[PDB]
Design an enzyme around this catalytic site. Structure first.
Site, short mmCIF file in Angstrom:
data_model
loop_
_atom_site.label_atom_id
_atom_site.label_comp_id
_atom_site.label_asym_id
_atom_site.label_seq_id
_atom_site.Cartn_x
_atom_site.Cartn_y
_atom_site.Cartn_z
CG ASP A 179 -6.38 5.71 -0.56
OD1 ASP A 179 -7.52 6.03 -0.18
OD2 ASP A 179 -6.17 4.87 -1.46
CB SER A 224 -11.60 9.98 -1.21
OG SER A 224 -11.38 8.88 -2.07
CD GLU A 283 -3.15 -0.59 0.17
OE1 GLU A 283 -3.16 0.57 -0.29
OE2 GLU A 283 -3.97 -1.46 -0.17
CG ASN A 321 -10.86 6.30 0.73
OD1 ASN A 321 -11.21 7.48 0.80
ND2 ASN A 321 -11.03 5.56 -0.36
CG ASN A 351 -8.61 7.17 -3.94
OD1 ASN A 351 -8.82 7.27 -2.73
ND2 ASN A 351 -7.67 6.38 -4.43
CG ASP A 398 -13.75 8.77 -4.55
OD1 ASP A 398 -12.63 9.25 -4.30
OD2 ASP A 398 -14.26 7.86 -3.86
#
Ligand SMILES: [Cl-]
Ligand SMILES: [Cl-]
Ligand SMILES: [Cl-]
Ligand SMILES: [Cl-]
Ligand code: NA
Length: 129
Positions: free
Chosen positions: A52, A50, A35, A59, A46, A48
Site C-alpha cells: 500500500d 502487495s 490510513e 494497493n 501486505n 499477499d
C-alpha cells in the site's frame, strides 16, 4: 510530505473530492488520517506480497505498478512511486477510480472501521475552505 489536517482538506477540495460519489470531504480526510497519518510517503507491505502506497494507502495488487507484485493489475496506470509525491494529484485521481468501482469507500479498511458511521464533518471543522 506530512500534511496538516486543514491543508489536506483544502488540497482535496481543490482536486474535486468534496462530495465525490456522495462522500463529503470529512470522509476523505478521516480516511487519510487513519490510513497514512497524513504522510504521503507511507508504505505498508501486505501478507499477499502487495504494498500500500501513499496518503490513501493504494494497493499494488490492483491499482499501481511497483514491479514486485506478480500477477497484479495497474488500473490507475501509474507507477506506485507516483503515489508518494508531495503533490497528491495522482493519489486523488486514482482514489476517484477506486471509489467509483462499486464498493465505495469500503475499499479503505480504516475508513470502514474508523470513519464510517462517525461524525466525519469534525475532520474539517475549523478549516478555511
Ligand atoms: Cl464532511
Ligand atoms: Cl491511531
Ligand atoms: Cl508487478
Ligand atoms: Cl457508495
Ligand atoms: Na500492480
Amino acid at each position: 510530505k506530512v500534511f496538516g489536517r486543514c491543508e489536506l482538506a483544502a488540497a482535496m477540495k481543490r482536486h474535486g473530492l468534496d462530495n465525490y460519489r456522495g462522500y463529503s470531504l470529512g470522509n476523505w480526510v478521516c480516511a487519510a488520517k487513519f490510513e497514512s497519518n497524513f504522510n504521503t510517503q507511507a508504505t505498508n507491505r501486505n501478507t499477499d506480497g502487495s504494498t500500500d502506497y501513499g496518503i490513501l494507502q493504494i494497493n499494488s495488487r490492483w491499482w499501481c505498478n511497483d514491479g514486485r507484485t506478480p500477477g497484479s493489475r495497474n488500473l490507475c496506470n501509474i507507477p506506485c512511486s507516483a503515489l508518494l509525491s508531495s503533490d497528491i494529484t495522482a493519489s486523488v485521481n486514482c482514489a476517484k477510480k477506486i471509489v467509483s468501482d462499486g464498493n465505495g469507500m469500503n475499499a479503505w479498511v480504516a475508513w470502514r472501521n474508523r470513519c464510517k458511521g462517525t461524525d466525519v464533518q469534525a475532520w474539517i471543522r475549523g478549516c478555511r475552505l
